[PDB]
Each structure stands twice: as structure tokens, then as C-alpha cells.
Design a protein around this ligand. Structure first.
Ligand code: FVD
Ligand code: GNP
Ligand code: CL
Ligand code: CL
Ligand code: CL
Ligand code: MG
Lengths: 167, 469, 166
């Protein structure tokens, strides 16, 4: 039947990365969540008129298990590389995440999107132009998202699915 | 009828329940949300005890109430006013007789004494199982000592005197088994010859046993204080989550050590023996229910430097490929088979902690701190209950000790294992991948030959234990 | 995984807490810290079936004697503990037995009679006297030592079997 896409979220810890998938998969309209619930990370969606199933792996909180990244990344067909727009270090981490994905997938052309995440009202330190330039240097889309208003969230995942479909 | 209560003006915990101050989930009630006053009332309720609630509350309350304020509130809860004499008592006294004081006696027996005792039970659990509040705030401890040490009256006396001693013990602060542990197993390296200890020279059974004791100890040392508030992800994580981080760093180091042992063995035949030995260790981990150990191995075998060694893979026996496959299948579909296996085995076990970390973090991030109802902000207690369900599961697997004997030298060897040396992580993992490319180059480059590096026999002694008299 | 709610009852100081902590942690508690109410969980395979034991450890001190209905309502099975060197704790057993039967409105509540401290030589309650009482209740009698572990698993897991067969 319908295609299932195995998506993997990667990025620095401690800066609200988990809000991306929570807000997507959520009862979009009731702010509540049980992640232990079987298939709290599976979602049927319609993208460009084509129904599909998203299976999202987000290991947020396990960042210190750095030798498990390959194990987790290997499951994925497409990747969301997430940094926080108020944390320059998380933005600088992106290059190595991308290199590690290319290595695990043994490909220089892995479907992926760069996501700049606004996780609080603290001052932005990564300007959108910096992140656009980085994404363009990699040849991948850039999406900014809010961890509070759900803005950009659907765009981030749907854009990634389009990258997979057009690979 | 029900007992009458003090006026809510002199005793705040007698206000009637309403949706402006408490909300229940759909045979004791389960609280969805409430004011802190109502949470503390139900924490110390006169009609029933709720020891699970006590654990949940004491584990999670700091996200909505400071320790100093909690103590003030439970002291307030404790100080219950007694009712005045009733009309019948008054008439008895006016006639020079002793009043029956029936209503007073009932209120003491059925309200004051249960509530006071349950306040003391909160104090007792707080001191016994959440003593870090008092380690980190000496004045809080002074206040608790003074409160407990000045409770008067005979009904509470046994527990007051007990709690005083418990506190004093905690300030200045042994396993029995149904069996003898099995005999420590030795291979090429003999007892006391730590300079020869290595992956292939220690007995694979004993590598797995000693790593399991080490990983069990690391697992058992993690307290809920290192988890609530997602503090292991925040800037002060080294201060607030040191035992958790030590545990994870051990796991990371062992995975990297496995990868290093593999890719630094340049001779194909020798490298096959290394991988086979690692899968034998995995087999013993499975037998011991050391799921942390299982995943340390799986992570190494699925890593970029190891995964691509097709020439090494081709020579691994079928039975060992199957063992590794079954271990990897535990992690598939968001750990579906792992979760079911963990819930079916007979402890002791060593769980994989990463799943708990993600579930705690997502529970805290994905649920609001308060619910707004009728213009009031109520503490969202269901969110805290969900977190405490996870910390409770963690604690349940921390109780059971392994019936295995420590070997101090092998223990020290794995405690001091440092595969990265002085190298940073990126430089070291690039090194491992370049080593992989060297020993098995990308097609169409030809496969080179390399000299042997081990002077001792490569044959495994196997993983079934031996038993002399 | 079936969940079983076990409750440990009996006179103050007979060893209810030491028994429970020995089962949970494999450790003997030498101190006598009177319990108010404690709860423990233990996953364990019994007769090939994995289950989850919820164990309620209750107060034996008489000052808490008016607070028992609430835990007796929730419990599925009861370990009725006395100490074999304390005749009064044996005489207290029937008060617990009768209260449990009243609260649960049942003549057929899963229970096990436990004679604890069997490591001590100076016995004052004979096994035969306790066994007679257990037979009159229709329940097994198991002597235990929280200090040495003798009988501890047998007592708790026999109670699980009683609940399972109920
Ligand atoms: C040196 C080496 C390397 C491996 C690496 N390895 C491989 N490949 C595939 C590519 N050819 C090379 C072996 N596939 C897997 C798998 C799974 C295969 C199918 N089901 C999903 C999981 C899992 C793991 Cl943990 C390790 C794996 C395996 C062994 C046994 C080995 F010795
Ligand atoms: N020798 C010996 N001493 C025991 C045994 N079980 C308990 N004790 C001792 O008896 C004392 C009381 O134990 P405890 O477990 O606190 O009893 P309890 O029935 O839980 N008391 P309470 O009803 O007040 O909570 C402690 O000093 C304990 O070490 C046993 O099997 N053998
Ligand atoms: Cl669309
Ligand atoms: Cl920054
Ligand atoms: Cl427990
Ligand atoms: Mg006790």
C-alpha cells in the first residue's frame, strides 16, 4: 500500500530539538504527549496529494551515547539536521553531523534538510542568512521552526519527504 | 455524617474540592491537576494512604515547589486545630460531669492522627530516599530536625524518635544470596598478570561477567535527581548528573574499544578471531540479561568502521551471524523486542538507559507545567506522574544484585580502559574509519595482506562455563 | 505481565520490613525503624510466568491500628507475619485475619501465615501451634528468616500462587 519514510532527527542536545517531532506528531491541537505510547512517532500524512506514513526516529536525550549515532542513523532514509538559532555551537556542530550521515549511508547525496529551531525567547545568535548560506553550500533546503507555535514544523518534514521523493 | 473540619480560614487544607483547585482523572482517585495546597492535602489524606503518590511527589515536586516551601506547607498541614466542645459536652460540664467528647475523639482518631502520621511518612520518605535536598541546603536540614524534634504527644512519639535517628544516620553516611557465585574463569592471561590482559587473552566469559558487574554498578548508582528536570541535557549536567554521565561514558568507551580492537587488527584471519570473540562476549551478555552490554556490541558492529568489513563478515560462522542479528533485532522498530524482553526476563538485568532518557525528556518537553481552568493555574500533576513512572521503572531494576564474584584486576582493567587516549572524538573516529579503509579498501582497490600481530593462540575457549570440584 | 498486590501485616517488630527488603534488595536491615507505610515493586518469574509484585509494607505499631481498612481494601493477598520468639505477636494474628475478612467481605482471601526470625534458637511459638492455626484458616505456614533468607522467597511466592489460584 502506502509508502513509509524512515526519517531521523539529529542535532545537539539541550536546546529543544525534541519539540520538532512532538509538535508534528502531537494531537496538533492539544498540548499533551506520552512518548512511551507505541507509535507516538508514526504519522499518516498527505504530501502533494500522495498519502504516506512517516516513521520518525528522534533519540533526543541520548546525545552522550555518541558511539550509537551510526546505529541510529543507519535506520534512516532522510535526515533533519537541527540546530537552535540561539546556540552557535549547535549550528557549528552541523558540519560533522552531515559528514557522519554521508559516511553511514556511504553516499555524498543523502536526502536531508537543515532546520533552525527557535526554542525560546533568548536572543538569536545565528542569523537566517548564515544558515541559508550553509544550506546552499550543502545543496539542501533550510527551514526555520518555532518550538512553541508549531510554525515551520510541517514544512520541515514535508520538505524532507520531497527531497526523498526527488532523490 | 462526615466529620466536620476546621474553618478554611484557620486551616487552609479544609477548603472544599472544586474544579478551581483540583481535577481528577477519569479505588482511590488519581489527580490530573491541582493547586499545591490540594496536592499536599491528598499527599497526606485522612481517608487513605498513597505510597506511590508519596514517591511520585517527592521525586518531582521541585518543578513546582521549592524544598523550603514544601517543608513550610507540610508543617502547616501537620498543625491541625482541634474542635471545641459540643452542646452535649457543654451540658455535661455544666452539671459537673465528664463530657463524652465523642466528636473530639473521633476527629483525633480519624482525621488528626492519620493526617499527622502521613505527614511524618512524607518526612520519612523525604529523608530516606530524597536526602539530596538536605545535603544541598543545610538550613533545610536544620528546619527538618527542629520540626521532628519538637513534635509532642504520645501518638506520634515512636515515629518522631525513629525519624530523628534516621536523620542523624543519613548525615554521617551488604548482600545475601541463595547460591555461591560461579568460579572466576581464566584463559591466556593468568591471575595477577594485568600487563597481558586484552580482548583475546582474558576469558570471554569473565570479560562479560566483569563488564556486567561494572555496568550493573554504574546503572544502580543513577538517582532520580540526575533525571528530573532533564538536567543531564543542560549546561550544568556534569554537576547534576555525574553518575548518569559516568555510566554513558563507560558504554561509549567500550563500544569504541570494540571498534578499535577490530580495525587495528590488520590481518584478516586475526580480525575474524577478534570479531568472533566479541560476538561470544555478546552471547554471554544476553545470558546475563546485560542489555547495556548487548547494545554496546551491536553499536560497535553497526558502526561505520566495522559495518563495511565485508571480507571479515564473510568468514564469521553462521551461528554467530544469527546471534548478532537477533541482538540487533532487539533495537528494531523503536526497541519493540527489547522492551518486551526486558519486561519478561527474571532479574538481575542491566537495562539500556537511553530509552528512559528520551522518554523522560519528551514527557517533560511535550506537556505543559500548568493547566488553566476557570481562571486558575493548576499544577499539571499527570505530567509529573508520567515522569515518576519512568524513574520508578528504573529503580525497580536497580534493586537486584548479580551473584557474580568481582575480580579486582579485571575490574580495574575495564575501569581504566581509554581507547581514545589523548585524542579528541572526531580525530579518533576519523582514525578508526581510515583504519577500516586501510585494512579493507573500497572496491575496486585490491585487498592487501597484513602480517599477524598476536603471538598467542587465537582459538577461543568458548562461552560455556567450567566447574572443577 | 500480571500485577499482584501483596500486603505484609503483623505486630510491630516481627520483621515485616526486614522480610520485604531481603526479598527486594537481598539485604538484611538490622535497625528497627517502625514503618508507617512503604511500597516496593519487584519483577520476577514465578512458575515460568513473569509478574510484577507490588508489595505494601504496613505499620505494626498499635498507634496506627485505626488506619488499616484503606490498605486491606487494595490488597489481593496478605502475608500474616508473627515472630516465633514473640507469643503476643502470634496471638495478634487472628485480629489481622478477622479484620481482613471483614474489610474484603470474604471468607476466602489469599493469605500465608509466616513465622519469622527462625534463625533464633530461643523459640516460644512451636511450629505445630502455628501449623494448627494455618490449617484452621485453610492456608500454608512458612517459617522464615529475613536475616539468613531462609524461606523468604517461598513465603512471598507461595502467596502469589494463592492469588493466581483464587
Ligand atoms: C565485520 C562485520 C560487520 C557486520 C555488519 N553488519 C551487516 N552487514 C551488511 C553489509 N555487509 C557486511 C555485514 N549487517 C548487519 C546487521 C543487520 C543486517 C540485516 N538486518 C538488520 C541488521 C546488524 C549488525 Cl549489528 C551488523 C551488521 C556484521 C558482522 C557479523 C561482521 F562480522
Ligand atoms: N534475628 C532476626 N532478626 C530479625 C529478623 N527480621 C527482623 N529482625 C529484626 O527485628 C527488628 C524489627 O524488624 P522490622 O523489620 O523493623 O519489623 P517490622 O515488623 O517491620 N516493624 P514495624 O511494624 O514497626 O514497622 C529489627 O531489629 C530487625 O533487624 C529475622 O528474621 N531474624
Ligand atoms: Cl501537501
Ligand atoms: Cl550562542
Ligand atoms: Cl522498589
Ligand atoms: Mg516495618
Amino acid at each position: 500500500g502506502m509508502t513509509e519514510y524512515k526519517l531521523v532527527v539529529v542535532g545537539a542536545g539541550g536546546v529543544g530539538k525534541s519539540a520538532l517531532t512532538i509538535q508534528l506528531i502531537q494531537n496538533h491541537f492539544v498540548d499533551e504527549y506520552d512518548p512511551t505510547i507505541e507509535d507516538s512517532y508514526r504519522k499518516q500524512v498527505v504530501i502533494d496529494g500522495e498519502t504516506c506514513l512517516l516513521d520518525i526516529l528522534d533519540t533526543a536525550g541520548q546525545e552522550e551515547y555518541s558511539a550509537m549515532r551510526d546505529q541510529y542513523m543507519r535506520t534512516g532514509e532522510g535526515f533533519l539536521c537541527v540546530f537552535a538559532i540561539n546556540n552557535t555551537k549547535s549550528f557549528e556542530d552541523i558540519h560533522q553531523y552531515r559528514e557522519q550521515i554521508k559516511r553511514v549511508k556511504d553516499s555524498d547525496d543523502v536526502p536531508m534538510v537543515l532546520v533552525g529551531n527557535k526554542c525560546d525567547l533568548a536572543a538569536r545568535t545565528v542569523e537566517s542568512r548564515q544558515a541559508q548560506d550553509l544550506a546552499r553550500s550543502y545543496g539542501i533546503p533550510y527551514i526555520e521552526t518555532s518550538a512553541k507555535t508549531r510554525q515551520g514544523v510541517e514544512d520541515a518534514f514535508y520538505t524532507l519527504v520531497r527531497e526523498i521523493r526527488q532523490h | 455524617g462526615q466529620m466536620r473540619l476546621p474553618s478554611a480560614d484557620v486551616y487552609r487544607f479544609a477548603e472544599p474540592d472544586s474544579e478551581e483547585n483540583i481535577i481528577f482523572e477519569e479505588g482511590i482517585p488519581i489527580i490530573k491537576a491541582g493547586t499545591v495546597i490540594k496536592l499536599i492535602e491528598r499527599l497526606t489524606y485522612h481517608m487513605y494512604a498513597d505510597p506511590n503518590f508519596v514517591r511520585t511527589f517527592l521525586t518531582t515536586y521541585r518543578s513546582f515547589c521549592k524544598p523550603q516551601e514544601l517543608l513550610s506547607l507540610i508543617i502547616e498541614r501537620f498543625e491541625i486545630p482541634e474542635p471545641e466542645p459540643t452542646e452535649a459536652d457543654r451540658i455535661a460540664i455544666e452539671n459537673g460531669d465528664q463530657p463524652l467528647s465523642a466528636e473530639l475523639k473521633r476527629f483525633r482518631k480519624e482525621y488528626i492522627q492519620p493526617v499527622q502520621l502521613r505527614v511524618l511518612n512524607v518526612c520519612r520518605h523525604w529523608v530516606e530516599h530524597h536526602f539530596y535536598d538536605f545535603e544541598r541546603d543545610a538550613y533545610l536540614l536544620q528546619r527538618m530536625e527542629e520540626f521532628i524534634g519538637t513534635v509532642r504527644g504520645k501518638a506520634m512519639k515512636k515515629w518522631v524518635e525513629s525519624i530523628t535517628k534516621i536523620i542523624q544516620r543519613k548525615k554521617i553516611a551488604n548482600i545475601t544470596f541463595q547460591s555461591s557465585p560461579p568460579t572466576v574463569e581464566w584463559h591466556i592471561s593468568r591471575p595477577g598478570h594485568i600487563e597481558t590482559f586484552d580482548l583475546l587473552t582474558l576469558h570471554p566469559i569473565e570479560i562479560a561477567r566483569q563488564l556486567t558487574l561494572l555496568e550493573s554498578d554504574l546503572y544502580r548508582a543513577v538517582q532520580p535527581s540526575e533525571l528530573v528536570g532533564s538536567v543531564w541535557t543542560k549546561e550544568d549536567k556534569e554537576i547534576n548528573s555525574p553518575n548518569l554521565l559516568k555510566m554513558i561514558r563507560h558504554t561509549t568507551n567500550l563500544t569504541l574499544w570494540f571498534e578499535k580492537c577490530i580495525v587495528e587488527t590488520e590481518n584478516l584471519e586475526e580480525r575474524v578471531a577478534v570479531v568472533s570473540r566479541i560476538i561470544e562476549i555478546l552471547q554471554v551478555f544476553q545470558e546475563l540479561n546485560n542489555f547495556n552490554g548487548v547494545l554496546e556490541v551491536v553499536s560497535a558492529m553497526n558502526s561505520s568502521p566495522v559495518y563495511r568489513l565485508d571480507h571479515t563478515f564473510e568468514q564469521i560462522p553462521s551461528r554467530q551471524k544469527k546471534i548478532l542479528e537477533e541482538a540487533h533485532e532487539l533495537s528494531e522498530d523503536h526497541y519493540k523486542k527489547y522492551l518486551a524482553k526486558l519486561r519478561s526476563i527474571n532479574p538481575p538485568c542491566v537495562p539500556f538507559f537511553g530509552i528512559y532518557l528520551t522518554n523522560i525528556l519528551k514527557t517533560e518537553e511535550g506537556n505543559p507545567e500548568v493547566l488553566k481552568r476557570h481562571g486558575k493555574e493548576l499544577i499539571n500533576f499527570s505530567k509529573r506522574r508520567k515522569v515518576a513512572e519512568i524513574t520508578g521503572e528504573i529503580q525497580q531494576y536497580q534493586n537486584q544484585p548479580y551473584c557474580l564474584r568481582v575480580e579486582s584486576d579485571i575490574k580495574r582493567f575495564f575501569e581504566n580502559l581509554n581507547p581514545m587516549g589523548n585524542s579528541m572524538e572526531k580525530e579518533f573516529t576519523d582514525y578508526l574509519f581510515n583504519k577500516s579503509l586501510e585494512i579493507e579498501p573500497r572496491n575496486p582497490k585490491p585487498l592487501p595482506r597484513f602480517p599477524k600481530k598476536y603471538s598467542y593462540p587465537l582459538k577461543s575457549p568458548g562461552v560455556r562455563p567450567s566447574n572443577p570440584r
